[model samples]
Target: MAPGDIEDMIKAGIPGARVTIRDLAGDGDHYAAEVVAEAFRGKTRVQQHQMVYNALKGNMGGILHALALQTSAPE
Candidate 1:
């Protein structure tokens, strides 16, 4: 998927999430993203990232490759 496609997926899935996506390798498959949302407030690190991975809808290893991802909750 494209960078904006991933960002759109995340925003749609997480509702109010703030999503920043980058194509790290200059290939559409290589991506990194930062997600910040109130929805992640009480989640653990794995859980937070899983939410993002899930938002990608199983794109990892399919349409997308390595995703170095980070998640944060608003203060």
Candidate 2:
């Protein structure tokens, strides 16, 4: 999937989330994302990751091949 498409889905799902996506392999399929938002203030790392996975709606391992994600709350 396209980086913009992933950004759109995450932004739409997380409200005020700041999402930055990079093509890890320059192949457009593997990606690395850094997501930051106030919504993650007190959530655990696993929960934070889950939130992003949920946002992808079931496209986690299907259309989207690989995603290296880093999530954090706004400081």
Candidate 3:
């Protein structure tokens, strides 16, 4: 997937989100992202990542299940 595509989904799912597609290596196979959102403040790490996972709605996951997500609350 394109970096902007993934970032778009992250923002689409979570309100007040700041999403960055950090790495897209190996011809878009190796991907990683950093998402900062107020919604992540109270959620556990599992919850945070899961939220972003669902954000993609299996579109990317179906094709590539190797996305790296690092999420946290905004400072």
Candidate 4:
């Protein structure tokens, strides 16, 4: 999947989120993202990750292969 696609999905999912995506393998499959937003405040790590997955709209385990997500609230 393209980095732009991921960015778009995440941005849409979490309004005002700052999403920085990296192609870890440069293969368009493996990716790492640093996502920060106030939406993550008071949420657990698992919940935060879930929001990211939900943003993909069920594309995470399918079209998108692997994603290393770093999710957190802004400092």
Candidate 5:
């Protein structure tokens, strides 16, 4: 998928999130994202990434390809 697709998923799932998506492979499949949100305040890195993955449901299994996530709580 594209950056906007991940942004939409993260925004919808994380709630009041600011998502920045970057293309890692230039194929539009591999990606990385920095997510800023309150929902991640007490969450671990693994947990944070899980939430984002959950947002995509089954889409992550194939269509999304690869994802590298960096998450932070909002100030």
Candidate 6:
């Protein structure tokens, strides 16, 4: 998937989200993203990851090959 696609997916998933996506492997198979979303507040790391996963739905298996993502609720 394109970087913009990933970023768009995140923003749509979490309202008021800001994302910076980096291509980790240059192969488009691996990526890292820094996500800041209000929805992440009061959530644990596991929960944050789950939220992103839920957003991707079936795309995780078919589109995105790997992700090294960190999420936060900025204060």
Q: Between prediction 4 and prediction 5, which has the larger lDDT?
A: 4
Model 3 weakest 10-residue run by lDDT: 21-30
Candidate 4 lDDT by residue in tens digits, 9-60: 9999899999999988687778888899999999998899889988989866
> lDDT per residue, candidate 3, 1-75, as tens digits?
664788898889997899877556556666888899998999998999889888988878543457887889998
Candidate 5 collision pairs? none
Off by over 4 Å in 1: 62-65
lDDT (Cα, tens digit) per residue for candidate 1, span 1-75? 544888899898899999887887687667788999999999998899888888878856743338788899986
Tell me the lDDT of candidate 2.
0.85
Give the residue spans of candidate 3 off by over 4 A.
62-65
Question: How close is every model to the real structure, measured as TM-score?
Answer: 0.85, 0.88, 0.84, 0.88, 0.82, 0.84
State each model's CA lDDT, in order: 0.83, 0.85, 0.81, 0.86, 0.79, 0.79
> Candidate 2 lDDT, tens digit per residue, 30-63?
7889999999999998899889988989765643
Predicted structure 6: clash tally:
0
Candidate 2 global TM-score: 0.88
Model 3 residue 39 CA deviation in Å? 0.6
lDDT of 4 at 68: 86
Candidate number of the best lDDT: 4
Error of 2 at 31 (Å): 0.4
- The residue pairs found clashing in candidate 2 are none
Query: Alpha carbon lDDT of residue 23, candidate 3?
Result: 55
